Structures are given as structure tokens and as C-alpha cells.
Amino acid sequence: EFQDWPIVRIAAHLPDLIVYGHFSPERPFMDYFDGVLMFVDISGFTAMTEKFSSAMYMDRGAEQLVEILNYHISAIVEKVLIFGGDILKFAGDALLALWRVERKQLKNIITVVIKCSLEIHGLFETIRVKIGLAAGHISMLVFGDETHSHFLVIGQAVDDVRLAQNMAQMNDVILSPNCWQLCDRSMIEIESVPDQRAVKVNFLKPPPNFNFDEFFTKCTTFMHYYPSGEHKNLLRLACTLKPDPELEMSLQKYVMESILKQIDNKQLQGYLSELRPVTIVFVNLMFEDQDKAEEIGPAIQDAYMHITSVLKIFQGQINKVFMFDKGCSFLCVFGFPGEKVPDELTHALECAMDIFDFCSQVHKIQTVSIGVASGIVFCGIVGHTVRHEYTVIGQKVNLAARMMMYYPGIVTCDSVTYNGSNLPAYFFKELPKKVMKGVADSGPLYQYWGRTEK
Numbered sequence: 001e002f003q004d005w006p007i008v009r010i011a012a013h014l015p016d017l018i019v020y021g022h023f024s025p026e027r028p029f030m031d032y033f034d035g036v037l038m039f040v041d042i043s044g045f046t047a048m049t050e051k052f053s054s055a056m057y058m059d060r061g062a063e064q065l066v067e068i069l070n071y072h073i074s075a076i077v078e079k080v081l082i083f084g085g086d087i088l089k090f091a092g093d094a095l096l097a098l099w100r101v102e103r104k105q106l107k108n109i110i111t112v113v114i115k116c117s118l119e120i121h122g123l124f125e126t127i128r129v130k131i132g133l134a135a136g137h138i139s140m141l142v143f144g145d146e147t148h149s150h151f152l153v154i155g156q157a158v159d160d161v162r163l164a165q166n167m168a169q170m171n172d173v174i175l176s177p178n179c180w181q182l183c184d185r186s187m188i189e190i191e192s193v194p195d196q197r198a199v200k201v202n203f204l205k206p207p208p209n210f211n212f213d214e215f216f217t218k219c220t221t222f223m224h225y226y227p228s229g230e231h232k233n234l235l236r237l238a239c240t241l242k243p244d245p246e247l248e249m250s251l252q253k254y255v256m257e258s259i260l261k262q263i264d265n266k267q268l269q270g271y272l273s274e275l276r277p278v279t280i281v282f283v284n285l286m287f288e289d290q291d292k293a294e295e296i297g298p299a300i301q302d303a304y305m306h307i308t309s310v311l312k313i314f315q316g317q318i319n320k321v322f323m324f325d326k327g328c329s330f331l332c333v334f335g336f337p338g339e340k341v342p343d344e345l346t347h348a349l350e351c352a353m354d355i356f357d358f359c360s361q362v363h364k365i366q367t368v369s370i371g372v373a374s375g376i377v378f379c380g381i382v383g384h385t386v387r388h389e390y391t392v393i394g395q396k397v398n399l400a401a402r403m404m405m406y407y408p409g410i411v412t413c414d415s416v417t418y419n420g421s422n423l424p425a426y427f428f429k430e431l432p433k434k435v436m437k438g439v440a441d442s443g444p445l446y447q448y449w450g451r452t453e454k
């Protein structure tokens with residue numbers, strides 16, 4: 001069986017949630033289901049990024065970093081896939097995976113996912129990982145325009161895996177409160193986590209008669225897309241997709257144009273692994289605690305329509321979209337493949353301010369915050385051959401992310417963006433520098449005030 005079609009190469013960049021969805025063209029589009037989520041924090045392994053920028057790597061730092069990082073992440077991805085998971089998205093610091101099932105099967109799948117999580121830690125018993133698990137209701141949001149599409153999962157099961165991850169330490173498996181409540185406590189030995197109703201898994205000791213492989217095989221019964229039969233030894237059913245112009249047209253909207261060029265063998269397959277000077281514009285849109293996914297969807301859609309319009313003008317791109325802690329964040333990048341300018345900084349700031357001004361007027365968005373940072377970041381396709389994504393990794397990515405969270409409601413920028421801007425100083429305001437999560441000394445940070453006092 002030949003399987004190297006463009007449609008298959010595109011499907012590699014997407015989860016089954018998208019590849020085998022059959023939903024409408026209306027945007028936003030929303031859907032609701034239940035499942036188990038797994039969040040694998042892979043920092044410590046992506047904190048090395050600074051080492052590989054050193055002159056010791058003789059201008060092959062990016063290539064060496066992508067190689068060693070994919071060595072490890074692809075092993076994590078194989079475990080997830082073999083246990084029936086769907087990897088939803090990659091980021092420099094983590095990956096999120098989903099086991100979507102009927103509510104009545106959540107109990108058994110949690111055991112599958114816990115076994116998976118511990119086999120993942122088993123891969124690193126000679127850097128390590130941190131794993132959070134959650135279970136419950138999940139809402140999916142698809143937004144975009146006629147040429148591009150983005151998706152998110154939303155809900156407290158998503159927020160649950162957020163906090164479960166934040167509590168974890170190296171080699172931990174933390175289960176959200178609702179996951180612990182729905183899990184098979186007959187099999188899962190836990191321990192308290194102080195002043196937190198979430199729990200840490202110590203052992204998975206099953207009944208004497210329990211045979212996991214038979215148990216897993218029965219669980220695959222409810223996994224709609226687990227490879228089986230003649231395809232039992234494929235990691236993804238996506239690998240079997242055949243040409244379908246209508247499906248490919250839909251799928252390619254989720255994929256960055258430069259990726260598609262490479263997919264089409266119109267660009268060298270290594271062109272996108274690089275250490276590149278870029279400007280990160282990290283946009284956060286916050287909604288109120290009580291806001292529900294059917295009201296958030298339209299707000300994100302309206303914000304997105306304007307965001308993409310401004311980025312096209314100032315020649316930026318959306319690398320990633322996330323949502324947790326009731327905030328939807330856009331990881332935007334300027335100076336990405338091909339399109340780099342020496343006025344990129346003023347454009348990034350002006351684009352930020354434009355996005356700040358519009359989005360603050362979108363209703364149901366309570367707060368807009370944008371962090372801007374410029375510097376060298378690693379760019380590359382990260383993951384497994386059969387499931388990977390273009391991602392950016394580096395100090396300035398994390399800095400932009402921290403700035404938008406620690407300085408809400410304004411546009412902030414780093415000392416690099418400030419000095420290099422083709423703009424005068426009174427356009428800015430030096431900020432009180434706060435102590436931020438896992439951040440080296442910033443340098444001075446600034447608020448982009450804009451051209452007016454008003």
C-alpha cells in the first residue's frame with residue numbers, strides 16, 4: 001500500500017479530532033463530548049534550547065536541537081498513539097492528548113491513560129517529564145475564515161488538566177479531582193496533595209486476575225479510529241487516507257503555507273529547522289469565569305477575523321492558539337519563513353496596538369493583554385513522523401507569554417523591541433519589573449503606550 005500522498009502528509013499535522021470530523025462550514029463551529037485528557041510537560045528538555053544556541057554547535061544548533069528533541073518527543077507520541085490517544089497539539093513546553101469516549105467508558109479509559117502515563121515516565125528512567133490527567137465534559141471550538149481554520153478544546157476538564165499539570169513535579173502523574181472521582185479506585189493507589197483535592201498516582205496495582213492487554217483490547221472496542229485488522233500495525237489510521245480533494249481542501253486550511261510548500265516538495269525538507277531572529281506577539285483574550293463556551297466561540301471568531309487581517313498587513317502569522325484559565329491566547333510571530341524586515345519591530349508593536357484596540361471592543365472579552373519580545377528562537381517541525389507540528393521554542397517565546405499574564409490589560413515589550421523600534425521613547429513607559437515564573441532577568445520591560453497621551 002502506497003501512503004505518501006499529500007493528503008496524508010497534511011493529516012500528520014492534525015489530530016483525528018480534525019481529520020475525521022465532518023462538521024459544517026459555519027464559523028464558529030462547536031461540538032461537545034466527554035473524554036480523558038493528558039498534558040505532558042516537556043520543559044527541562046526544551047530549556048536546553050539556550051545550550052544549542054552556543055558556538056559549540058558550530059552553526060548546526062537548530063538541526064541538533066530538532067534532532068535530539070524529536071528523538072524524545074516521538075517516543076512520547078508513540079506511547080500515546082499505541083494506547084489509543086489522539087495528540088491534539090504540540091507546544092515547545094508540552095503536548096496535549098485526548099481519549100474521546102462515551103461517558104460510561106470514562107472509568108476504564110482512565111486506567112488505560114494512567115498505564116500510558118507511567119510507561120511514558122518509564123522511557124526516561126536513565127531529563128524527565130511531568131504528566132497531568134483530567135476527565136469530564138469537553139467542548140471543541142473551530143474558528144477561522146474561508147482560507148484558514150483553528151481549533152481548541154474548552155471546559156473545566158481542560159482547565160482541570162491545566163492545574164493538575166501545574167502541581168506536578170518530575171516523574172509525577174497527577175489526576176484532577178473529577179478524574180480521581182470517576183476513576184477505578186479499586187486499581188489506583190494515590191496520595192494526597194496538600195490543600196489540593198487533586199491526587200498523585202503512586203501505583204496501578206490491578207486485581208490478581210487482571211490482564212492489561214486483554215483489558216486494553218476490549219477498550220479498543222470503543223476507540224472509533226484505533227488501527228486494526230489489516231492495519232493493526234499502523235500508528236495512525238490517518239496513514240491510510242486516500243486522495244479526496246474536498247477533504248484536503250478542508251484540512252489544508254489548518255496548516256501554515258510554508259509547511260504546505262514543503263509537503264508539496266517545493267521546498268527543501270530541512271528549510272524550517274532554524275535558529276531565527278523573530279518577534280513574538282503573544283495575545284491573550286480573557287473572558288469572565290461564568291462565560292460558557294457558546295458565548296466565547298463567537299467572541300474568539302470576531303477577534304480572529306480582525307487579528308488575521310492585521311497580521312496579513314504587517315506580515316505576521318499565527319503559530320499556535322491556546323485556551324486555559326478562561327483566557328484564549330494567540331502565539332503570533334513576525335519574521336517567520338521568508339518574510340523578514342528591518343522595520344519588523346515597529347510593525348509588531350503597531351500590529352499589537354491595533355489588535356489591542358479592536359479586541360478590547362469585542363463584547364464578552366473582559367481583558368486584552370499582549371506581550372511582545374524579539375530575539376533568536378528555534379523553529380522546526382516537532383513530534384513524530386506520523387504526528388508533528390511546526391513550533392517555536394525559546395527564551396523570548398516564554399517571556400512574551402509571561403508578560404501578557406503578569407501585565408494584563410496592556411501591551412508590553414522587551415528591551416530588544418523597545419530600543420530597536422523606529423519610534424520615540426515617549427511612545428513607551430518603563431514598567432515595574434516583576435518576578436516571573438521561570439524567567440531569567442528580563443532586561444527592562446516597557447508598556448507600549450502609543451502615539452498619544454489619550
Ligand SMILES: CN(C)CCOC(=O)c1c(Cc2ccccc2)c(-c2cc(Cl)nc(N)n2)nn1C
Pocket residue numbers: 039088089090091092093094095096151152153154158159161162163165321322323324401
Ligand atoms: C503558554 N504555552 C507555551 C504553554 C501552554 O500550554 C500548552 O503547551 C498547550 C496548550 C494550552 C493548555 C490547555 C489546557 C491545560 C494546559 C495548557 C494546548 C491546547 C490545545 C487545544 Cl486543542 N486546546 C486548548 N484549550 N489548549 N496545547 N498545548 C501544547
